[PDB]
Paper text:
The LPs are localized to the OM where they are attached via a lipid anchor by a process known as the localization of lipoprotein (Lol) pathway. The ABC extractor presents the extracted LP to the transport protein LolA, which binds the anchor and thereby shields it from the hydrophilic periplasmic milieu. At the periplasmic face of the OM, the LP cargo is delivered to LolB, which completes the Lol pathway by inserting the LP anchor in the inner leaflet of the outer membrane. As most Gram-negative bacterial pathogens, the genome of the phytopathogen Xcc contains genes coding for a tripartite Lol system with an ABC-type extractor, the LolA chaperone and the OM insertase LolB.
In the present study, we present the experimental crystal structure of the LP-free LolA-LolB complex from Xanthomonas campestris pv. campestris. The crystal structure of the Xcc LolA-LolB complex was determined in the trigonal crystal form R3 with two LolA-LolB heterodimers in the asymmetric unit. LolA-LolB heterodimer 1 (LolA1-LolB1) consists of chains A and B, and LolA-LolB heterodimer 2 (LolA2-LolB2) of chains C and D. In both heterodimers, LolA and LolB interact in a “mouth-to-mouth” orientation with the LolB hook inserted between the two β-sheets of LolA, similar to what was first proposed by Okuda and Tokuda. A six-residue long loop between β3B and β4B in LolB (residues 74–79) forms a hook that inserts like a wedge between the two β-sheets in LolA. An annular opening is formed on one face of the LolA-LolB complex. In the lipid-free LolA-LolB complex, both paths that lead from the annulus to the hydrophobic cavities in LolA and LolB are closed off. The path leading to the LolA cavity is blocked by residues in the LolA lid domain and the LolB hook, and the path to the LolB cavity is blocked by Trp81 in LolB. Due to the different conformation of the LolB hook in the two non-crystallographically related heterodimers, LolA and LolB in heterodimer 1 (chains A and B) are slightly more tightly associated than LolA and LolB in heterodimer 2 (chains C and D).
Numbering used by the authors:
A (entry chain B): 19 to 198
B (entry chain A): 1 to 125, 129 to 188
The structure:
């Protein structure tokens, strides 16, 4: 690895880890086996706390998942029946919609960071020293395209594909919002 | 009077083609999502929502199946077309008798936004409540509120009455490489 690329990737991660409140908006397509779905995603993060709104296309019906990565619990509002909650936010979402998304790991993966206290992650770098693929926690995460940098905003992913067996997530991040 | 407008508008209506703009707002009216494109309707169960800006997305109801296609994501979701009048009342225009069947229709007295409104309160199971706003050129606005208070306001313009549709207006044509998935539950 280039020494200038080594320092740039270390400063990218340290900047992101030092600014734990952020949000993004984008579009997601989920798949497991032959079924799946898609919709517009708003993701707000405040340290370990996430607030995730998915706005559906024809149904017009959004759901809102709220959870906490330190406990893993989450609650899901907006669906017919009323609000569902449980110890595993990924499983709450799975039982209610049939969608698999690893919600407790996304806050790190979507920023191209690996989870802390999770078990050594295999990391492959692109030719610039940016993560290209991350293997962690059963999931393989590919970083296909990057959002341009600016003085205020470090390089952050723009197109991700994550897979675990036959569970597939494709994510387009259209707009990041970060601390100043 | 607003029911006058709906019946003047859908008087002898077999097809409809026009443009839309969509604003999704939060409780305090701040826009959270805004987009625009083309919408087409034809009796008795065919519609097409063509988002153009800021990204392309195509929704097509061919009469038997509903397709949600996102080109940037290279995936289309397909499901059978059941009762799509409780997911978009816009189809209940080309068949105006449907409205009173699944919706407890009710006419607001106060004109709003410059328009005469109909409240579409739902009986069949969707959304929490719709509202159709009529002005000088017919249907001008549609508003839907979901269970978590998020409102979608759709405006219309350039309505073309009973047009000559290309024979794939209401068909989904897959492109190479696209993943075709069912609707998960």
């Amino acid at each position: 690895v280039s020494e200038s690329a080594r320092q740039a990737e270390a400063a990218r991660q340290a900047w992101l880890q030092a600014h734990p409140a952020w949000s993004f908006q984008g579009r997601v397509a989920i798949s497991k086996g032959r079924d799946g779905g898609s919709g517009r995603l708003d993701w707000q993060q405040d340290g370990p706390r996430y607030h995730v709104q998915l706005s559906a296309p024809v149904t017009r019906q959004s759901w809102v998942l709220t959870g906490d990565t330190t406990t893993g619990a989450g609650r899901l509002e907006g669906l017919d029946g009323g609000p569902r909650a449980g110890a595993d936010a990924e499983q709450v979402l799975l039982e209610a919609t049939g969608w698999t998304i690893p919600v407790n790991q996304m806050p790190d993966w979507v920023r191209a960071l690996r989870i802390a206290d999770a078990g050594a992650a295999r990391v492959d770098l692109d030719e610039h020293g940016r993560p290209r693929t991350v293997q962690q926690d059963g999931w393989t995460i590919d970083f296909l395209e990057w959002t341009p940098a600016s003085a205020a905003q470090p390089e952050l992913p723009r197109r991700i594909e994550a897979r675990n067996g036959d569970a597939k997530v494709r994510l387009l991040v259209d707009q990041w919002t970060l601390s100043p | 009077g607003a029911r006058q407008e709906l019946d003047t508008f859908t008087r002898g209506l077999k097809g409809l083609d026009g443009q839309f703009s969509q604003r999704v707002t939060d409780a305090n009216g701040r826009v959270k999502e805004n987009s625009s494109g083309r919408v087409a309707l034809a009796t008795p169960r065919q519609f097409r929502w063509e988002y153009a800006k800021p990204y392309k997305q195509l929704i097509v109801a061919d009469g038997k199946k509903v397709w949600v296609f996102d080109p940037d994501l290279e995936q289309v979701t397909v499901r059978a077309q059941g009762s799509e009048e409780q997911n978009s009342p816009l189809v209940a225009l080309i068949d105006p008798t449907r409205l009173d069947k699944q919706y407890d229709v009710s006419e607001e007295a106060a004109p709003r936004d410059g328009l005469q409104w109909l409240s579409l309160t739902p009986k069949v199971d969707s959304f929490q409540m719709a509202s159709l706003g009529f002005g000088k050129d017919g249907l001008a606005k549609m508003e839907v509120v979901d269970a978590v208070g998020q409102r979608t306001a759709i405006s219309f313009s350039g309505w073309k009455r009973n047009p000559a549709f290309a024979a794939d207006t209401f068909r989904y044509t897959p492109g190479k490489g696209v993943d075709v998935v069912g609707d998960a539950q």
